[PDB]
């Protein structure tokens, strides 16, 4: 065994080893290992991405106009965000500016994805870590109605409703076919809701499973389908015609009416169902405001997103702010430049890749994706792993750093950056939320805080959907219909050699695509994705990433039941296909 | 009792699993609660780690010969199969063990059916579709990237209601939804037959809904239900929202030239 | 002034004359006049249909295969019922038998219409006679939640929901643009609900206005569109393909899945919203069990409907019973024959039509539709009717009689026929309903009873939708897909001369179409429609029809505000376009 | 304040009023509560008789020159107009009074636009469309029997949002929804082009969704949005459910021969 110090942690791999493989209620493809001491406290944590596909290799030699469709298939959960980053990257390289309506529609596509992805995460992925589903069978339906009505104006709250949901669950389990609930952690001492709150949350899990299908109708109108909508370099393909012959062949007033109807319904569900449930989880689980801090009180990163001035990616345009904090100094929000070779770099000394010098980091314009499966001296063998060796290479995930620092990305990171830049709406929302829980601001830097910030952001994004829709309609009233720029669509119009960066804030954090074009073809295409940051393995200094840091120092009630590990990992919304691409 | 279903995931992006939960009729909630018993699924299940491994073993043992195996994604043959690792072993070993006890296999999506994006040139991981590994079980191919939500749920309801597999074409695709081409039920066909084409994005032709053939539409060579059943409760499909078909239901569609080159 | 005796009534046209023109919250096109005595009690009532189009004339010379499409446009409220009667009549004339799936689908079309038409009548047409909308502004939202939860399991019952509905109504009213609520009867002493019940009812009015649009999606799947779906002579045009190439072009498993989802939602709404609201109207308005009896304790008529054995219109096949009662003798339910010239006859001595002898009645195979506008002295002119002259011709509606008797048709009529034929389900349901209201069986023969019977028919029809869907699916599992017979589609296969009758129970009552075919074309086409019976003018013996009888003997609290007249007329669901055709 | 609307009814079957309440987006509830002030409508209003006459008189007087008049159905010229009687007098008098104060008129449906079924041979009442009687006001024709629900609500929202009437063709129909033929956006056009036709009901061709031209479809001569926007929240349209177009949006469609004779 060894022991060393990094980032205020003591990393010690003596003592009992626990393995969690598979991690479930994520997209898939993660392994986690920890060591625990005699006091059932985590003293070492190991994050491993267990798949790889190689999109950066597949993109070589492709037409730049096609790239968005290939990289969209990095992920069907965060569907669309890689297409957006791609068209941004290719437009930056070639020198294309899109019409205002194309930028507005792209912002609608991104806000739609934030609402859908955040809502499904809260209920279908994270919810069963906090709600004891089998304990819902013990609730009194009238007391459940009274609880729900004390928290929200949402209409669906009758005693008869909660009894009907409870009886559906009772029937489901009475044949002994428990399905997704089989062999769960039910009755664990960390389940703290009363039976009435379990029944309320389970009813809401079912309501959200049904409602989420409606949100993505916005993607179907502008992008054809969800999952995996369509886009173009130069704007969007969804031509608009409101008052001319042939409007039946285009985005017309009836299509816009459908979009408006979905926006209103989406805002209502998020504000009256998800927001009060997130606050209720907080009220009943306040100790989790001090568990899972990790890097969130040290180093956080946002690129920024939602340019409101078309083709302007600067500070005055981006509606979701960008910036970086290091060394715990939230009084110094630093500017980020994605072209600077000293800022974003990726290391592979602890990952399954080859570099000419694995002791140094490479900026993505100098990036290399040369896969090399070499797990070294594992317990077991190379095709039957019992324990990864975290002193050597242990993941398909590269290790990104910012100026050499390990960073956390995602909803909590963005909330902290916006709060400390002085964004008025963020400051008001956070202050009101923490006041309601009677918790200090530092309570947001935690596993519970990640969940609260995600709910905050779903509400924010639902409000921005209306804002962008109104902006689109204002242009149409003024006779401004354009959706595509095509003066640089043909390859003969491009520079012989050029490079560009496309960046945004995906639901899980800071996303960048770096592209180089030569002689009409993709010469290099490198992606650094939010879960690549958070699920990162170690670097040559032994610095740990956001998941490994957030698991450090966690108490476990029952070592064989990983509920506390699941709570903290799920709070980041891991997307492992994204992380490895 | 409801029919046991085991759903496993190889190299994949999760799009077919997401498509399934978009179903409008029956709701995915009602499929899980009332039509089938979804007994294993890494994306939805409560149990993780050793508890999830115990579920997998218990279900494939107690219901040996009686469960349906749903597969999203595909196995990589490179690096001894360790481009996709499950419980510390090659994913292919979990696929073979799950397949051996199944009564039948549903290959959801172009990944499981043919290869999809990871198998496009140069295929770094040597990703291989399910029917090149499993050669002794019935496999129904349901291709698309992903397949249409209400096609997925209609196939499931057919199998439960009628207690049999759907009739298939010579490639193993259900005749009901894959028997005809996109271009044989496309609402822009009048424009194709008249020579009325979009020539550049957002031109006057585009604003009247003219045909997308000159913009690269692959509808003429693609079999699926997108131009009739449509997507997301019938709201739209790629062509209706102004982009040509990519050909995403067909084997090898990524390597047939640019999406913007004519068919 | 004069007076005479008929059917137990004293018809007396002395005293003050009141005119109600237009009657609103019907399809349109009705005038009502009454005389009241010195105690403000109605001693004379006059029913007048104020429009005519002449479909029976327009149908002459048409191809019999086209007839359904023309006569469907008799009415867009009871949309489809005239098409069904037409295809039945042409098939009866030519000698065509349809496949079992076509019959099942036609029964689904009719049950869907019953559900839709009865639901929209209860809320949008009759509701504001019983609910004081402006009084809802005085309700306590918590007490409204409590009331709703005591009556039903329906989920939508939170105090915040009822507050939100109430605030929306307050903002609507506050600017003085009261729309459909302007110059209403609000505050009339016959409004007996407490403020909480008025708010609950208004919330449900709005829920029903939204939900009704979904029910007709069943008509869109099998019939292309609603209003006015498509049909064929020989079956239905909606070919079925479940498991063969090209199912994308036909009724397939996805289309059937959509139909099933609509059936379940429709039953849930009717059973948990409409049914408890109807029973509550009964509880708070018991005196209306003794008002508006009219002919319902004297003479009632049903032809029967919903043949469960394909092409068999006999008593063992029809799921909704047929029969007639006369002279108050409910112990002898009599059989009806639509070919017998001594049974159904229409008179025009008090209507705007010419017969060679207006003192005799004509069976529809001998019918004549020769319009003659001749109002006599109306205290104004031919283009200014100040007072109809009920001693002579006063309506565009003909006067149908059954064996010379004036009859009531519709939900109450049907319920009484089925009850007295000893249908076990009907006996049990009626007995339990009247028991819960603590009223005698005779309480059903009233204005309140008409409303209770309509709601219990909506429930019955929603149950039969599932029964018919399951029968369709059973045939498909057994490989029986046929939807059309075409052996006799071509006119060269028809008899040179033939005649037939098509009959059903529309939402408002007994419907018949009589057709004669000669040399491949329609020679005669005569319709007798449910509101033709109910809204009938007088005959040569002075006998009064169902509306005039039900208004007789009624007390009015405020003569100038006709709320009691509206309550009783709306209880029949008048369709004046149907009545005149 | 919301724009005042007066809705009157001549000879009609009520199908256009019923179509309006079928709207999916915006819901008819939200049109009435938030977008317009529906100040007179015989099918929905609380007031009857003298109280309804008072509403009519007060609205057209207070808002003279500023309300929109919606018309469903038509006036008959036979029997001195007494084939359609309102408040004891010919409907035509109410029509002329209401038209005189309106800023613009919406003629809903084939009845108000052209004549529809009551005007089909031999037209016993001499039913006559609105534009032959009212000759000094803007009239927007929205034909169909009835028009599509979501077309009706889209036209309303266009007028409220943009504060202008829609641009129209030479017959007064909105270009947005009536600029193209049914057959120019029909998903069965591939079959028409190939000579692939239904020949008798429920034949093998009908079960594969072949073209309905030989069954009498009037799509090739009819202008409407049914084959693109579709009916009842996009669920179907006449052709998709197996019956040819009747031609119901076109002037004189009842008297162009049998619905089952070819164009
Ligand atoms: S848009 Fe594509 S599928 Fe449609 S007609 Fe044109 S080429 Fe064929
Ligand atoms: S079904 Fe009618 S509209 Fe469609 S292609 Fe055939 S003829 Fe044209
Ligand atoms: N959100 C998201 Fe997916 C990840 N990580 C991307 O980009
Ligand atoms: N119901 C109905 Fe209409 C009437 N009366 C018909 O038939
Ligand atoms: Fe649904 S996993 Fe998504 S990539 Fe194309 S089918 Fe594969
Ligand atoms: Fe909507 S009233 Fe119905 S008949 Fe043809 S449009 Fe007329
Ligand atoms: S790209 Fe795919 S989704 Fe349908 S329209 Fe073409 S098969
Ligand atoms: S009949 Fe009418 S509804 Fe449309 S498809 Fe033809 S114009
Ligand atoms: Cl492929
Ligand atoms: Cl016409
Ligand atoms: Li740019
Ligand atoms: Mg990368
Ligand atoms: Mg008649
Ligand atoms: Ni992702
Ligand atoms: Ni009617």
Which two structure tokens, joined as six digits, stand for B106? 């549903």
Smallest Cβ–Cβ distance between C159 and the set A149, A163, A164 belongs to A149
Which two structure tokens, joined as six digits, stand for A534? 């958070």
Report the alpha-carbon angle C430-C435-C441, nearest 5: 55
Whether residues B61 and B136 share a domain: the answer is yes
Q: What is the CA radius of gyration of chain A?
A: 24
Is there a cis peptide before residue C22, judged by omega within 30 degrees of 0? yes
- Domain with D102 in it: what CATH number? 3.40.50.700
User: At residue A14, what are phi and psi to the nearest 5 degrees?
Assistant: -75, 165
Among the three residues D129, D162, D177, which one is the final residue of a domain in this structure?
D177
- Length of chain A in terms of residues written: 581
For residue D130, the Cα-to-chain-centroid distance in whole angstroms is 12
Whether residues B215 and B153 share a domain: the answer is no
- Domain with D246 in it: what CATH number? 4.10.480.10
The answer to whether D243 is a known ligand-binding residue is: no
Cα maximum dimension of chain B:
63
3-state secondary structure of C525: strand
Cα distance between residue C482 and residue C367, in whole Å = 37
- Give D21 Cα–ligand 6 centroid separation in angstroms: 15
Residues B98, B104 contacting (CB under 8 angstroms): no
Whether residues B196 and B166 share a domain: the answer is no
Cα distance between residue B43 and residue B11, in whole Å = 14
Cα distance between residue A301 and residue A318, in whole Å = 15
Residues D8, D94 contacting (CB under 8 angstroms): yes
- Give D190 Cα–ligand 1 centroid separation in angstroms: 10
Whether residues D40 and D149 share a domain: the answer is yes
Cross-chain residue pair D185–A242, CB shorter than 8 Å: no
Q: How far is residue B195 from each of residues A247, B203, B213, measured CA to CA in Å?
A: 19, 15, 10
Q: How far is residue A547 from each of residues A18, A78, A94, A209, A535, measured CA to CA in Å?
A: 16, 20, 37, 28, 6
3-state secondary structure of C446: coil
Residues of C in contact with B189 (CB under 8 A): none
Report the alpha-carbon angle A281-A283-A284, nearest 5: 70
Cα distance between residue A94 and residue A234, in whole Å = 10
Whether residues B197 and B165 share a domain: the answer is no
Report the alpha-carbon angle D123-D128-D133, nearest 5: 160
Element (DSSP H or E) covering residue C203: helix C195-215
Residues C294, C544 contacting (CB under 8 angstroms): no
Cα distance between residue C33 and residue C46, in whole Å = 5
Give the number of whichever ligand sits closest to the CA of residue A87. Answer: 11
Exposure string of C332-361, with b = 16+ CB inside 10 Å and e = fewer, is: ebeebebeeeebbbbbbbbbbbebeeeeeb
* Resolution for this experimental structure (Å): 1.4
Whether residues D142 and D173 share a domain: the answer is yes
Give the dihedral of Cα atoms C159, C160, C166, C167; nearest 10 deg: 150
> Which residues lie closer than 8 Å to C471 by C-beta, 6 or more apart?
C104
Q: Which residues pair with C11 in a beta bridge?
A: C4
For chain B, list the contacting chains (3+ Cβ pairs, <8 Å).
Answer: A, C, D
Residues of D in contact with A249 (CB under 8 A): 180, 185, 228
Orientation of helix C411-421 relative to helix C447-477, angle to 10°: 70
* Helix/strand/coil (H/E/C) assignment for every residue in C79-97: CCHHHHHHHHHHHHHHCCC
Cα distance between residue A187 and residue A328, in whole Å = 38
Is there a cis peptide before residue A416, judged by omega within 30 degrees of 0? no
Give the number of whichever ligand sits closest to the CA of residue A348. Answer: 12
Which two structure tokens, joined as six digits, stand for C545? 């029809």
Tracing tokens 């324990």 back to the chain, one arrives at: A387
Among the three residues B177, B208, B231, which one is the final residue of a domain in this structure?
B177
Cross-chain residue pair D25–A245, CB shorter than 8 Å: no
Q: Give the chain D residue whose CA is nearest to the CA of B190.
A: D184
Q: How far is residue D60 from each of residues A514, D10, D65, D99, measured CA to CA in Å?
A: 65, 18, 8, 9
Whether residues D121 and D42 share a domain: the answer is yes
Element (DSSP H or E) covering residue C508: none
Residue from D141, D12, D236, D124 nearest C73 by CA = D12
* Helix/strand/coil (H/E/C) assignment for every residue in chain D: CCEEEEEEECECCCHHHHHHHCCECCEHHHHHHHHEEEEEECCCCCCCHHHHHHHHHHHHHHCCCCEEEEEECECECCHHHCCEEECCEEHHHHHHHHHHHEEEEEEEHHHHHCCCHHHCCCCCCCECCHHHCCCCCCEEEECCCCCCHHHHHHHHHHHHHHCCCCCECCCCCEHHHHCCEHHHCCCCHHHHHHCCECCCCCCCCHHHCCECHHHCCCHHHCECCCCCCCECCCCECCCCCCCCCCCCCCCCHHHCCCCCCCC
Check if A261 contacts D (Cβ < 8 Å). yes
Q: Write the Ramachandran bin of C134: left for phi over 0, alpha for psi from -120 to 50, otherwise beta.
A: alpha
Give the dihedral of Cα atoms A115, A117, A122, A128; nearest 10 deg: 150
Residues C497, C518 contacting (CB under 8 angstroms): yes
Q: How far is residue A218 from each of residues A257, C213, D150, measured CA to CA in Å?
A: 11, 22, 17
The answer to whether B116 is a known ligand-binding residue is: no
Cross-chain residue pair B260–A65, CB shorter than 8 Å: yes
From chain C residues 187-246, the ones with a CB under 8 A of any chain B CB are 241-246
3-state secondary structure of A572: coil
Mutate to test the pocket of ligand 2, among D187, D191, D206, D211 (most ligand atoms within 8 A of CB): D211
The answer to whether B191 is a known ligand-binding residue is: no
Cα distance between residue A509 and residue C387, in whole Å = 78
Q: Which residues pair with B85 in a beta bridge?
A: B90
Cα distance between residue D208 and residue B180, in whole Å = 9
For chain A, list the contacting chains (3+ Cβ pairs, <8 Å).
Answer: B, C, D
Residue from B247, B255, B198 nearest B223 by CA = B247
Sketch the domain layout of chain A as residue ranges.
Answer: 1-581
In eight-state DSSP terms, residue C388 is -
Exposure string of C224-236, with b = 16+ CB inside 10 Å and e = fewer, is: bbbbbbbbbbbbb
Q: How far is residue C90 from each of residues A5, C387, D24, measured CA to CA in Å?
A: 93, 42, 36
Is there a cis peptide before residue B122, judged by omega within 30 degrees of 0? yes
Q: How far is C243 from chain B (nearest CA, A)?
A: 5
Q: What is the CA radius of gyration of chain C?
A: 24
Burial grade of B128 (CB within 10 A; 0-12, 13-18, 19 or more): buried
The total domain count for chain D is 2
Orientation of helix C141-151 relative to helix C275-284, angle to 10°: 110
Residues B69, B104 contacting (CB under 8 angstroms): yes
Residues C185, C561 contacting (CB under 8 angstroms): yes
Residue from C181, A546, C358 nearest D45 by CA = C181
Residues of B in contact with C473 (CB under 8 A): 161
CB-ligand 6 contact for D118 (6 Å cutoff): no
From chain C residues 370-409, the ones with a CB under 8 A of any chain D CB are 371, 373, 380, 382-386, 396
Residue from B103, B104, B79 nearest B92 by CA = B79
Q: Which structural domain range is residue B249 located in? A: 178-263
In eight-state DSSP terms, residue C138 is G
CB-ligand 5 contact for B225 (6 Å cutoff): no
- Tally of CA atoms within 13 A in the half-sphere of A135 that contains its CB: 21
Whether residues B205 and B244 share a domain: the answer is yes
Whether residues D169 and D184 share a domain: the answer is no
Give the number of whichever ligand sits closest to the CA of residue D248. Answer: 8
Cross-chain residue pair D21–C212, CB shorter than 8 Å: yes
Exposure string of A454-490, with b = 16+ CB inside 10 Å and e = fewer, is: bbbbbbbbbebbeebbebbbebbeeeebebbbbebbe
Cα distance between residue B211 and residue B244, in whole Å = 9
Residue from B175, D79, D214, D234 nearest C385 by CA = D79
The answer to whether D248 is a known ligand-binding residue is: yes
Among the three residues D162, D177, D192, which one is the final residue of a domain in this structure?
D177
Q: How far is residue C242 from each of residues A370, B159, C234, C248, measured CA to CA in Å?
A: 50, 12, 22, 9
Cα distance between residue B129 and residue B73, in whole Å = 8
For residue A356, the Cα-to-chain-centroid distance in whole angstroms is 32
Cross-chain residue pair B201–A53, CB shorter than 8 Å: no
Residues of A in contact with D155 (CB under 8 A): 253
- Give C324 Cα–ligand 13 centroid separation in angstroms: 21
Cross-chain residue pair A252–D179, CB shorter than 8 Å: no
Whether residues D30 and D128 share a domain: the answer is yes
For residue A72, the Cα-to-chain-centroid distance in whole angstroms is 15
* Helix/strand/coil (H/E/C) assignment for every residue in C152-180: CCCCECCHHHHHHHHHHHHHHHHCCCCHH
Cα distance between residue C392 and residue C377, in whole Å = 9
Whether residues B166 and B241 share a domain: the answer is no
Whether residues D138 and D232 share a domain: the answer is no
Cα distance between residue D157 and residue A242, in whole Å = 11
- Length of chain B in terms of residues written: 263
- Extended strands (E) in A222-322: 300-302, 305-307, 318-320
Q: How far is D174 from chain A (nearest CA, A)?
A: 8
Q: Which of A46, A76, A79, A125 to mutate to test binding with chain B, by most B CBs within 10 Å of its CB?
A: A76
User: At residue C124, what are phi and psi to the nearest 5 degrees?
Assistant: -75, -30
Homologous superfamily (CATH) of A1-581 is: Cytochrome-c3 Hydrogenase, chain B (1.10.645.10)
**β-strand B89-90 against A3-6: which pairing, if any?**
unpaired
3-state secondary structure of C274: helix
Which two structure tokens, joined as six digits, stand for B22? 């978009």
In eight-state DSSP terms, residue A315 is T
Element (DSSP H or E) covering residue C431: helix C424-437
The set of protein residues with a Cβ atom below 6 angstroms from ligand 8 is: C 225; D 144, 182, 222, 224, 226, 237-238, 245-246, 248-249
Cα distance between residue A45 and residue A60, in whole Å = 36
CB-ligand 3 contact for A507 (6 Å cutoff): yes
Concatenating the DSSP letter of every residue in A168-186 gives: HHHHHHTTS--GGGTT--T
Q: Write the Ramachandran bin of B101: left for phi over 0, alpha for psi from -120 to 50, otherwise beta.
A: alpha
Atom of ligand 5 nearest to the CA of B18: 1
Residues A277, A122 contacting (CB under 8 angstroms): yes
3-state secondary structure of C501: strand
Burial grade of B58 (CB within 10 A; 0-12, 13-18, 19 or more): middle
């Amino acid at each position: 065994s060894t022991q060393y110090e990094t980032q205020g942690y003591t990393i010690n791999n003596a003592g009992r080893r626990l393995v969690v493989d598979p991690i479930t209620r994520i997209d898939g493809h993660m392994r986690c290992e920890v060591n625990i001491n005699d006091q059932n406290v985590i003293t070492n944590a190991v994050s491993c991405g267990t798949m790889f596909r190689g999109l950066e290799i597949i993109l070589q030699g492709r037409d730049p106009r096609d790239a968005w469709a290939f990289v969209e298939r990095i992920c069907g959960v965060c569907t669309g965000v890689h297409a957006l980053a791609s068209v941004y990257a290719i437009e930056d390289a070639i020198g294309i500016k899109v019409p205002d309506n194309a930028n507005i529609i792209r912002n609608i596509m991104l806000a739609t994805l934030w609402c859908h992805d955040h809502l499904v995460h809260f209920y279908q992925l994270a919810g069963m870590d906090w709600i004891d589903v089998l304990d819902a069978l013990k609730a009194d339906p009238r007391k459940t109605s009274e609880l729900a009505q004390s928290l929200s104006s949402w209409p669906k709250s009758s005693p008869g409703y909660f009894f009907d949901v409870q009886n559906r669950l009772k029937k489901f389990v009475e044949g002994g076919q428990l399905g997704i609930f089989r062999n769960g952690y039910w009755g664990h001492p960390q389940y703290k809701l009363p039976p009435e709150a379990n029944l309320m949350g389970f009813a809401h899990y079912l309501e959200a499973l049904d409602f989420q299908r409606e949100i993505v109708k916005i993607h179907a109108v502008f992008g054809g389908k969800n999952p995996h909508p369509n886009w173009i370099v130069g704007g969007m393909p969804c031509a608009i015609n409101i008052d001319e012959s042939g409007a039946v062949g285009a985005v017309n007033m009836e299509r816009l009416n459908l979009v408006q109807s979905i926006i209103t319904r989406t805002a209502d569900f998020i504000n009256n169902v998800m927001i009060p449930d997130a606050l209720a989880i907080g009220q009943f689980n306040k100790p989790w405001s001090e568990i899972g801090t990790g890097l969130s009180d040290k180093c956080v990163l946002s690129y920024g997103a939602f340019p409101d001035i078309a083709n302007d990616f600067g500070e005055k345009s981006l509606l979701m702010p960008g910036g970086a904090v290091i060394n715990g100094d939230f009084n110094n929000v630093l500017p980020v430049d994605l072209v600077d070779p000293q800022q974003v770099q990726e290391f592979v000394d602890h990952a399954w890749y080859r570099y000419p010098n694995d002791q140094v980091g490479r900026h993505p314009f100098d990036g290399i994706t040369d896969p090399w499966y070499n797990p070294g001296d594992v317990k077991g063998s190379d095709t039957n792993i019992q324990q990864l060796n975290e002193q050597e290479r242990y993941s398909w995930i590269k290790a990104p750093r910012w100026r050499g620092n390990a960073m956390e990305v995602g909803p909590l990171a963005r909330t902290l950056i916006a709060y400390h830049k002085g964004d008025a709406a963020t400051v008001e929302s956070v202050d009101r939320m923490m006041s309601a829980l009677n918790l200090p601001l530092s309570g947001i830097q935690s596993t519970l805080g990640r969940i609260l910030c995600r709910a905050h952001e779903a509400q924010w994004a639902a409000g921005k959907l209306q804002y962008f829709f109104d902006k689109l309609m204002t242009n149409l009233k003024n006779g401004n219909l354009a959706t595509a720029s095509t003066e640089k669509w043909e390859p003969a119009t491009w520079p012989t050699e050029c490079r560009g960066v496309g960046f945004t804030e995906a639901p899980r954090g800071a996303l960048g695509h770096w592209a180089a074009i030569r002689d009409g073809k993709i010469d290099l295409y490198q992606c650094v994705v939010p879960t690549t940051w958070n699920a990162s393995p170690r670097d040559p200094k032994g610095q740990i990433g956001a998941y490994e840091a957030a698991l450090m120092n966690t108490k476990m009630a029952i070592p064989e039941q990983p509920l506390e590990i699941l709570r903290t990992l799920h709070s980041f919304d891991p997307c492992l296909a994204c992380s490895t691409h | 009792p409801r029919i046991p279903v085991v759903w496993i995931h190889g190299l994949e992006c999760t799009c077919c699993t997401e498509s399934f939960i978009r179903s409008a009729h029956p709701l995915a909630k009602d499929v899980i609660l009332s039509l089938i018993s979804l007994d294993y699924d890494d994306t939805l299940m409560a149990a993780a780690g050793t508890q999830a491994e115990e579920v997998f073993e218990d279900i494939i043992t107690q219901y040996n010969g009686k469960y349906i195996l749903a597969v999203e994604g595909n196995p990589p043959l490179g690096e001894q199969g360790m481009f996709c690792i499950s419980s510390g072993r090659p994913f292919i070993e979990k696929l073979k063990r799950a397949a051996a006890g199944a009564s039948a296999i549903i290959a959801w999506g172009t990944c499981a059916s043919w290869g999809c994006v990871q198998a496009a040139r140069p295929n770094p991981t040597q990703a291989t579709p399910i029917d090149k590994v499993i050669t002794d079980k019935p496999i129904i191919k349901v291709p698309g990237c992903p397949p249409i939500p209400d096609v997925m749920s209609a196939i499931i309801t057919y199998m439960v209601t009628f207690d049999r597999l759907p009739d298939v074409d010579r490639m193993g695709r259900p005749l009901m939804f894959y028997g005809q081409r996109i271009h044989d039920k496309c609402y822009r066909r009048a424009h194709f037959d008249a020579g009325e084409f979009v020539q550049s994005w957002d031109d006057d032709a585009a604003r009247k809904g003219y045909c997308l053939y000159k913009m690269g539409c692959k509808g003429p060579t693609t079999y699926n239900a997108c131009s009739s059943t449509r997507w997301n409760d019938g709201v739209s499909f790629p062509i209706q929202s102004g982009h040509g078909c990519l050909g995403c239901a067909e084997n090898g569609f990524w390597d047939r030239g640019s999406f913007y080159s004519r068919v």
